[PDB]
Design a protein around this ligand. Sequence first.
Ligand code: CLA
Ligand code: CLA
Ligand code: CLA
Ligand code: XAT
Ligand code: 8CT
Lengths: 193, 195, 73, 92, 207
Amino acid sequence: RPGNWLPGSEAPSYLPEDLPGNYGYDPLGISENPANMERMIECEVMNGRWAMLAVPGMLAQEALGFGNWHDAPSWVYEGGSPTWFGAGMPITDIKLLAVIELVLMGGAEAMRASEPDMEKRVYPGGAFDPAGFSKGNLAELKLKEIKNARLAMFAFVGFVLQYYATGKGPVQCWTEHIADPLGANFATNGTSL
Amino acid sequence: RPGNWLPGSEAPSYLPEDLPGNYGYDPLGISENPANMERMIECEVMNGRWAMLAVPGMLAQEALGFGNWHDAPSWVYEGGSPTWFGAGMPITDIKLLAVIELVLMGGAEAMRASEPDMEKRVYPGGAFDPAGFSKGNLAELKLKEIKNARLAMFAFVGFVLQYYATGKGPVQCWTEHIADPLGANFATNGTSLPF
Amino acid sequence: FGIGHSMKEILDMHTPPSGNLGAGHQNLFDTINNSLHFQLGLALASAGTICSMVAQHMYSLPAYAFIASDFTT
Amino acid sequence: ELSPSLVISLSTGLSLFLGRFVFFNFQRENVAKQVPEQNGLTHFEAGDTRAKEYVSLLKSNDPVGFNIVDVLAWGSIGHIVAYYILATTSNG
Amino acid sequence: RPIWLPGADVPEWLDGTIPGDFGYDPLKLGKDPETLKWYVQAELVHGRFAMMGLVGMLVPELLTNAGIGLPAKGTEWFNAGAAPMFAPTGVLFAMQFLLMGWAEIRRYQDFKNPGSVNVDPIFGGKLPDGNIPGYPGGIFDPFGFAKGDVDSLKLKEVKNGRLAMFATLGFYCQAVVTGKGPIACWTSHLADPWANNVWSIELAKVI
Ligand code: CLA
Ligand code: CLA
Ligand code: CLA
Ligand SMILES: CC(/C=C/C=C(C)/C=C/[C@@]12O[C@]1(C)C[C@@H](O)CC2(C)C)=C\C=C\C=C(C)\C=C\C=C(C)\C=C\[C@@]12O[C@]1(C)C[C@@H](O)CC2(C)C
Ligand SMILES: CC1=CCCC(C)(C)[C@H]1/C=C/C(C)=C/C=C/C(C)=C/C=C/C=C(C)/C=C/C=C(C)/C=C/C1=C(C)CCCC1(C)C
C-alpha cells in the first residue's frame, strides 16, 4: 500500500495489499468479499473519469466562457439562444439534442457493457493507448488516475454544496476566499449552525 | 567529530559520527529512529542552502537597492515588473511571473525528487561539482558547508523576528543598534520582553 | 412468445452478495405457486390496506358530486 | 409528409438501432438464461396446453435472426420516444 | 498507603498500582482493565487542562485586582467571553475545532495502537515520537525530565491536577452565585470570614 489513511489503524484483511490506491480505507466494511469488491474497483474508476472531465467544464466556463456550471448552461436555452458554446452559436435545438445523446451513449456504453473481461474493460488500451503501456510505468500511472479521480470526485460535491449555500459559481465562490480568507470562509454562512 | 554543544558530555548514542559537524545535539531526541535520521540529514542541508542563498539576497535588497524584503513584493505589487536587478524590468505579471518559479522549480526538484540513494541525491557531484574542489577530502568541506549553513538559517530567523516585531529590516537596525547600543535592543523598541 | 421475464429467475438472483439474507429469495416461487394460503394472505393484505386507503382519500377528496354536502353518507 | 409524419419515422429508427446494434447481444443473453417453469418443470409438460413456449412463429433470415416480436418490443419503445417528444412541449 | 478515608475499602479491582491512587472509586466506573486504562488518560488530559486553564482565570484577574500593574483586559475570567476583535466567532471557532481535532485524534489513535502514532513514512516530516504509553514524553518533555524522580513527579502532577480540577469547579459555582471575581470572593471572605461565607447566600440559604 502507498500509505495508510489513518496512522494507527491496521490494514484491513479482505483488501489485498495490491490494489490501485489502497490506503486501507474501508470504514463501513463495505466489501468484505473480494468477489463483490471488484465491481466497485471498476466502478470507482468510471465515476472518476466522468468526474474528472466534469470539473473543468464547471470552472472554466465560469471564469472563461462566462457561465455558471448550473443555471447558466441549461436556463439560457429555454427562454433564449440555442447554444452559446465557446461563444458561438450552433443550429441544434432543444428536444432533438438529447435524442442524439441516447443513440451515442447507449451506443458507446452498451458496446462497452458487453465484455467478458473485467480488466480489459477498466483498462482497454487498444486504440486508446498512445502512452505508457509497460511494466511499472503503467502500474504507476495506474495509481495516478485513481488518485486524481478520488480528488476529482470529492471536488464535485464541493461544486454542488457550495452552490447550494453561496449561490455563486465555483470560481466566483473561490475568488471570494483568496481575497479575504476570514469572513469569506464557509464557517460564516447558512451552513454551520 | 568536534566538541559538543553544551559541555555536559553525553553525546547521544545514535549518530554517524563522521556526519558533517555533529556536536551531539538532540535535546528532544528526534532522530533516534535511524531510518528517520536518514531523511533529516538532507532536510537540513537543503534548507540551509536556501538560507545560504537568501541571506545574502535579503542582505543586498535593503543595502544596495530599495526595499528590505516585505517591501519588495508590495512595492512591485502596484509596480509588477518594475524591479531593478543590475538592470531594468523585463515585462512579467504576478500570475505569469509565478508560473516560471513554480514550474521551473518543480522539475528541478522533481529531477532530484526520486534518487535511489540518499547520499547520491544530496551530494551528486559531477555536473554540480564543476570545480572539483571535492579533491580526496570532502569530509572537511562537508562539515565546513554545514557550519556556514546552520548559521545562515539561524541568521534568517534574526531577520524575521526583528521585522515581525516593531523593529524594521536588519540593515538599518544593524546601523541603528551600532548608533545607540542602549535603547536599540530586543527589549527596547522591540517590545520582545513583555513586561 | 418467449420474450419476457421468468418469475423465479427474477427472484433467485436477489440473494444479496453478502449473506445478510443468506440464500435470499430461493425456492420461494416454489412455496408461493404451490401454497394457496400464501397467495391468499397477500391478496387480503394487499386488498385490505387499499380498502382503508379508499376511505382515507374518499372523505378528503370527495370524487362524487354533491357529497360533503349531505354529510351522513 | 412533414414533421409529424417525419419525426415518428425519424424517432423509431433510434430504438431499432440500439436493439440490433448491441442490445441484440444482451436480450438474447438473458433469454437463454431465463426460462419459465413450475415445480421444476416448464409449463408445457405440467399439463398446461396454452403454455407451450412458442418459437415456431419466431424465425428470420435476418443476419442475426432478429425476429418479429423483437421488432414489436423495440418498435413499441420506438413509439414511446415518439410520443414523448412530440406530445409534451414541456420546457422545450 | 494513603487512603481517601483511612477506614474503608480499597476496592478489590483497584490495587495501589497506579500513582495518585488513594482507593476512591465509589461508583465503581473502572472495573474491567481496558476501561481503567482509558479513564487514567481522561484524568490527566483534564488534570492538565485544568491546571493551565485555572491559571488563565486566576492570574490575570489577580494582577488587575492586586494593583494597577497590567490590568487584565477582559476583566474577570467570565468577562473575557466578550473581547473578540479580529476574527468572527463563527470562523475562529471552526478553525479551532479543525486544528485541535487533528492533534487530539492523533492522541487517541495512539492510545488505540500504542507503539507509534505515526511510523516514519506517513505524515511527512514530523513524527519524532519517542513515546511511552500514558505519557507522551518526546517533544512534550523538552528539558528532559524523567531523570529518576518520575514516580514522585507522577504523584506531583496528578495531585496538583486533582486539586486544580476541583478548584476550577469552585470558580464556576462561585461566580455563578456571588457574581464577583475570585479575589473578590477571596478577600471578601478573608476580610470578614463569617458573614461572607457560603451558605449565608442563595444556595444553602434555602435552608
Ligand atoms: C526559517 C524558518 C524555518 C524553519 C524553522 C523550518 C523548519 C523545517 N523545515 Mg522549512 N522552510 C522554510 C523555513 C523554515 N523551515 C522556508 C522559508 C521555506 C520555503 C522556501 C521552507 C520549505 C521547506 C520544505 C519544502 C521542507 C522544509 C522542511 C522543514 C523541516 C525539516 C526538519 C526535518 O526533516 O525533521 C523532521 C521533519 C519535521 C517537519 C520536524 C517537525 C517540526 C515541526 C513541529 C513541524 C512543523 C511543520 C509545519 C507546521 C507543517 C505545516 C505547514 C504547511 C503544511 C503549510 C523543518 C521543521 C521539510 C519538511 O518536511 O517540512 C515541510 C521540507 O521538505 N522546509
Ligand atoms: C478539493 C476539496 C475542496 C476544496 C479545495 C475547497 C475549497 C473551497 N471551499 Mg469547499 N467544499 C468541498 C470541497 C472543497 N472545497 C466539499 C466536498 C464540500 C462539501 C462538504 C465543501 C463545502 C464548502 C462550503 C459550504 C463552502 C466552501 C468554501 C470553499 C472556499 C473557502 C474554503 C472553505 O471554506 O473551506 C470549505 C471547507 C471544506 C472544504 C471542508 C472539507 C475539508 C477537507 C476535509 C479537506 C480539504 C483540503 C483538501 C485536502 C484539498 C486541499 C489541498 C491543499 C493543498 C490546498 C474554497 C474555494 C466556502 C466559500 O467559498 O465561501 C464563500 C463555503 O462557503 N466549500
Ligand atoms: C530546519 C533546519 C534544520 C534541520 C532539518 C536540522 C537537522 C539536523 N540537525 Mg541541525 N541545526 C539547524 C537547523 C536544522 N538542523 C540550525 C539552524 C542550527 C544552528 C542553531 C543547527 C545546529 C545543529 C547542531 C549543532 C547539531 C545539529 C544536528 C542535526 C541533526 C540531528 C538533529 C535533528 O534531528 O534535527 C532535526 C531538525 C528539525 C526537526 C527542525 C525543527 C525546526 C523547528 C520546527 C523550528 C524551531 C524554531 C525555534 C524553536 C525558534 C528559533 C530559535 C533559533 C535557535 C533558531 C539533524 C540532521 C546534530 C547533528 O547530528 O549534526 C548534524 C548537531 O549536533 N544541528
Ligand atoms: C478540566 C476542568 C476545567 C477546565 C477549565 C478551563 C480549561 C478553563 C478555561 C477558561 O478559564 C480560561 C482558561 C480562560 C477564560 O477566559 C475562558 C475559560 C474557558 C473560562 C474541570 C474538570 C473538572 C472535573 C471535576 C470537577 C471532577 C470531579 C470529580 C470528582 C469530585 C469525583 C469523580 C468520580 O470519578 C471518581 C473520582 C470516582 C467515581 O467512582 C465517582 C466519581 C464522582 C464519578
Ligand atoms: C428489410 C429492411 C430494409 C433494409 C434493411 C433493414 C434492416 C433496414 C430492413 C428494415 C425494415 C423496416 C423498416 C422495419 C420496421 C419495423 C417497424 C417500424 C415496426 C413497428 C413497431 C411498432 C409497434 C408494433 C407499436 C407498438 C406500440 C405503440 C406504437 C403504442 C404507443 C402508445 C401511444 C403513444 C398511445 C398510448 C400509449 C402507448 C401504448 C405508449
